[PDB]
Amino acid sequence: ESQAFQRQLTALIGYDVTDVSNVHDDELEFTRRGLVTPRMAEVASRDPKLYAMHPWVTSKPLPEYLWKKIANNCIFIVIHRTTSQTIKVSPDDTPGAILQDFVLRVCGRDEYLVGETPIKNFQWVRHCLKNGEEIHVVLDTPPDPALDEVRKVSLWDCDRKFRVKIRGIDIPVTVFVEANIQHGQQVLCQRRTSPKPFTEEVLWNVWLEFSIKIKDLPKGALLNLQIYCQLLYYVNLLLIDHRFLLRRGEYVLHMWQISFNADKLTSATNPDKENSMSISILLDNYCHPIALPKRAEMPNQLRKQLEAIIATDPLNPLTAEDKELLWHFRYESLKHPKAYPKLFSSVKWGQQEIVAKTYQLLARREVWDQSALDVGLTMQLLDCNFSDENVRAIAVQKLESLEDDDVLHYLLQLVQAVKFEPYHDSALARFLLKRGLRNKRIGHFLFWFLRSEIAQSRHYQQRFAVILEAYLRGCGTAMLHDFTQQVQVIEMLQKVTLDIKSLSASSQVISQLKQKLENLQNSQLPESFRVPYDPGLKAGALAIEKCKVMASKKKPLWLEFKCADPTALSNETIGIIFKHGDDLRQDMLILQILRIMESIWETESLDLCLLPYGCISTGDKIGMIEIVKDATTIAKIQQKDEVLNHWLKEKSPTEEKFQAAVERFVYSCAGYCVATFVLGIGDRHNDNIMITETGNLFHIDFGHERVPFVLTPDFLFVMGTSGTSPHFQKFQDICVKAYLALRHHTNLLIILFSMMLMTGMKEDIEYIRDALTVGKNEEDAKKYFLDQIEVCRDKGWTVQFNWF
């Protein structure tokens, strides 16, 4: 009766937040009640009308390539009733002015054209102009906001050295315990136990005294415990808790098993108590509670040394000379905004006096607050290397400036950045909540980004579940209903995917698939649901006739659905692929960097025609993918030079379209050539590369003799070259222009890649350093990328054959 709402959330989240079996403290519960106020703050402040209609707008300028589509400075928009009427409108006109009570909704979508923004600033308009599609809208009644209703003694006095006694270990299946006092990634001090023979139970009952004092312990200090037989098991314990108190008492911590990573810094313990290793520890308990409280100019040559350090990439290491120089001239380093990540690495966190000096420094935020928002720099202070709550907070405040559109660009990476946070109720977690509760699109993707990690990562499911419950308790009854219609479908369809995969090592499989879905369609399944990757799109009834099982090494479910919106322009079905086997969380990350790459090029007035298809990971190596209409594989066309160009002319009806297809190929090919090379996912097979009948080429399957990228003689013949051509010159020109544009955002791409490698996947990250050629000049870099084209031209088909 009363607890029916919590059980409703538990089914949506995929984890029971009310469960307190895998906890040793009230951390998750304190953060649950602490997340009430920021949720209430956004629910009360948000506009009912604007939130219900969720307008997707951008304050960014209109691109140079998109102005070419608007003739005589007036675009055409058609308003529907049975009857339609075309209206010529200026790009600077507001929807109300075109309206001359009634809303302008997109035909066949849940996207609305409202607010004090011009038509050129609407994301749907910029999309229609790109693909060369007519802007079709319908005079609708505004959606009711009532559908979105919401249901309702000092530590610095302790001069004694820190110690912790390791009682023993226990496993049902030579060894020693490695104790570490960690702050981020840096180890303050290390102490190891005597090596005793490895058995079922190994007791020590000995105190491990550290060099660090109680006074010198910082906020967010971790007690890293490691088992070496070499490394086998790991576990962590936050020494200074969420209530600013030094931990006390007996603890039995279940350790995570191995075989660097975001999964190592986790405060959460192993839920598998009947199969994992455990550790018994005791912390010095006291009667009184121990709580934690709250110039001259640089010379010419030394300034040249300091400015050189700030100028280097985020991966370049800081020596003792570098760290001491940055800390001594911290006030001059404070003047430079790019110096902040390198400066906050130069500070001794295991020293009470030094940490206090970092706080009085940070107080003079006069230059940081006034500085231009650098997302690369902002994200830099949110990684594994930064664990001070106050240092991480100065980055989160800069993210507040970021508009809704740009929040969507980095939403996935910001969600993964929570893994690097020492405590649960953090500024970043509170930020993701507020931005998710303000905008329906941000909140929708937030739900799926959180639900993806909960379903797989047991290391962070407890943390992400309390963030999802906090979002879910303010998204409104309308979204809560939609999220259930989505969950019910994705869960029922995940069952069929794993069932069909188990039945295959044909006529039998396709007849059994059509059997399994038919009885599901005429049962408890919803009549309509929202597409997790395209929330504007709404899929209805299953097209059982068009449903099939794909023929590959894995057995995915090719599913087709009729559109729920009857105001849709075409009767075209929605295609969704349910695939098990590959890690879709990796595909999710690469596709996001690809979307960022498109925005990076947009600011530089470039359009490299990338196709970043929809992909949402739902469970254990299982999720959904977008079916790209009128698109096939390169290997499918082969099942050698003329073969690809002939397919383009065959699928082209008029010469007007084939001359457009060759241009659509030149941009899309060069775009994926640059993108895949930078991220180190360029040496791929024809089966993992696709092309549309419109000429748009795109890379697929990012589930983890050599060549930098794919530029085979079948593609070069489309351009008209054999081992120059007017199209090939256009290709190399845009290849240089696109590569040069990404080098202007090196630190962004370095920090995006570094995070991806830690949350999704040391020497491996070092790849982008050479790929984006750090240290070299713009003219020197031009020759490097042109030489990579020459490697592809010399190799040709040699690499493609080698893939067995």
Ligand SMILES: COc1ccc(Nc2ncc3c(n2)n([C@H]2CC[C@H](O)CC2)c(=O)n3C)c(C)c1
């Ligand atoms: C994460 O990888 C994926 C999976 C499916 C799609 N969508 C998709 N739409 C239409 C397709 C298609 N795939 N394929 C594949 C099947 C998988 C195989 O590996 C390659 C060929 C086709 O033959 N047609 C006609 C994408 C864009 C990426």
